[PDB]
Amino acid sequence: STGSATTTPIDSLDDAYITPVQIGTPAQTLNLDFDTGSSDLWVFSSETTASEVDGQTIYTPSKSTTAKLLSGATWSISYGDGSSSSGDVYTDTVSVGGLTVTGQAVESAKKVSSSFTEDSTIDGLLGLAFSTLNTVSPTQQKTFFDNAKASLDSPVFTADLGYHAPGTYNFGFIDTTAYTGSITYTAVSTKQGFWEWTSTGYAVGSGTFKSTSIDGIADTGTTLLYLPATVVSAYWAQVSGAKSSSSVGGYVFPCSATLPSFTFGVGSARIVIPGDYIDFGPISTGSSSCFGGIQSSAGIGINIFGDVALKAAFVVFNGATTPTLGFASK
Ligand SMILES: O=C(Cc1ccccc1)Nn1cnc2ccccc21
């Protein structure tokens, strides 16, 4: 089998992407954030604290003839940005772009933190990291991809995120019309549960390439590109008037600036992030100070190839016995 679903930015800045997902019988369609940096499929639901729901579409298990409470199971997650959610668990039928999994764990939120409440466009998360990160207790659950894998034509999924435009998530096949040139594959470590790889270096604008190993994760659920402070300083030094602002929480730059591109290495291959992809707009409405899309990972503990980086590429998440990652230009 295969699946193919369009993913759509939630706002004009590409802060996140939502992909429609069918849950239950008859289908309940929720728009989920596909997140290769986590491993829980959780949804706003009829069980969510009423004051914490504000515009989201909810899953109502009692209206699904295929829903079954997973007795005794609970879940609780906290993301790197400080947000969180928790609740109980059902199994149900879940379909993505024509690909169906029966018996998928669907984590029903009883509580969500303020940032989820405040974002009406995201009805929940669909994790695509390794199932060793899944938070369900006392019996850990498998991700949608891990449940689908043996049925797929090939044990892969691909992310093709758009810049200010829709993109695609495919399951089970590589669309050879969706990229240019060849796909370069690179080794993955699953030791921390992530799609963790090592970039071979970087360049700023038309500058020379610096060969240097940069370990990090491919994370569709992170908006920005988080890299070592040395690398990020080298980038922003090429933007007149850019500065790190302790009060704003990162690098800012004059909105009048033209940003240079940023290149990262994948083996001997190179992915070029155009400068416009690094502009995240005014820090507050009407401000002439803009927030940068490349930020330091120093407070985080891991480098993160978030959407800013991934949307510049066609990315293959190869879930073979020994997983790997592939990147192509597009
Ligand atoms: O948690 C993180 C990483 C992060 C971003 C910004 C600052 C510090 C750390 N991404 N992410 C991955 N999945 C997520 C789901 C919600 C929120 C963030 C999510």
Domain that holds residue 310: 175-330
CATH code for position 287: 2.40.70.10
First to last CA, the chain: 25
- How do beta strands 210-218 and 303-305 pair? parallel
Last residue of a domain, one of 146, 174, 202: 174
Could you tell which of 77, 79, 135, 227 is best to mutate to test the pocket of ligand 1, judged by most ligand atoms within 8 Å of the CB? 79
Tokens of 190: 């699953």
Q: Identify whether residues 94 and 105 lie together within a single domain.
A: yes
Residues 123 and 260 placed together within one structural domain of the fold: no
Q: CA separation (Å) from 96 to 7, 22, 28, 195? A: 11, 7, 12, 21
Which residues have CB under 8 Å from 168's CB, separation 6+? Answer: 4, 5, 6, 7, 158, 160, 175, 178
Alpha-carbon span 262 to 267, nearest angstrom: 16
DSSP class of 208: P
For residues 244 and 16, give the distance between their C-alpha atoms in angstroms, rounded to a whole number: 24
Q: 234 and 293, same structural domain? A: yes
Identity of the amino acid at 212: T
CA angle 152, 153, 158 (to 5 degrees): 75
| Phi, psi dihedrals of residue 294, rounded to the nearest 5° | -115, 125
| Probe target for ligand 1 pocket from 121, 222, 223, 295, with the most ligand atoms within 8 Å of CB | 222
- 85 and 75 within one domain: yes
Which of the listed residues 155, 174, 193 is the one where a domain comes to its end?
A: 174
206 CA distance to ligand 1 middle (Å): 30
Any atom of ligand 1 within 6 Å of the Cβ of 124: no
Residues 168 and 195 in one domain: no
Cα–Cα distance, 310 to 64 (Å, whole number): 35
Ligand 1, residues 81, 121, 135: which to mutate, most atoms within 8 A of Cβ?
81
Q: Is 227 exposed, middle or buried (0-12, 13-18, 19+ CB in 10 A)?
A: buried
The verdict on 113 and 188 lying in the same domain is: no
The whole-angstrom separation of Cα 86 and Cα 327 is: 34
- Please check whether residues 225 and 319 belong to one and the same domain: yes
Burial of 165 (0-12, 13-18, 19+ CB in 10 A): exposed
Question: Cα(159)–Cα(308) distance, rounded to whole angstroms?
Answer: 13
Write b or e for each residue in 83-122: b if 16 or more Cβ atoms lie within 10 A of its Cβ, otherwise e: ebbbbbbbbbbbbbbebebeebbbbbbbebbeebbebebb
- State which of 174, 201, 216 marks the end of a domain: 174
Whole-number Å distance, alpha carbon 54 to ligand 1 midpoint, is 21
Separation in Å, CA 263 to CA 38, 96, 231, 253? 26, 32, 11, 19
- 215: Cβ below 6 Å to ligand 1? no
CA of 214 to the centre of ligand 1 (A): 19
DSSP 3-state assignment of 69? strand
Residues 138 and 190 in one domain: no
**Protein residue with its CA nearest to atom 14 in ligand 1:** 221
Regarding whether 90 and 34 lie in a shared domain, the answer is: yes
Question: 26 with 145, same domain?
Answer: yes
Catalytic residue IDs: 35, 199
Side-chain-side CA neighbours of residue 83 (13 Å): 14
Technique of determination:
X-ray
Strand 41-43 with 99-112, pairing: parallel
Burial of 189-204, coded b for 16+ CB within 10 Å and e otherwise, reads eeeebbbbbbbbebbb
Do residues 181 and 277 share a domain? yes
* Tokens standing for residue 255: 């909105």
> How many domains in the chain?
2
Same domain, 215 and 316: yes
Resolution in A: 1.4
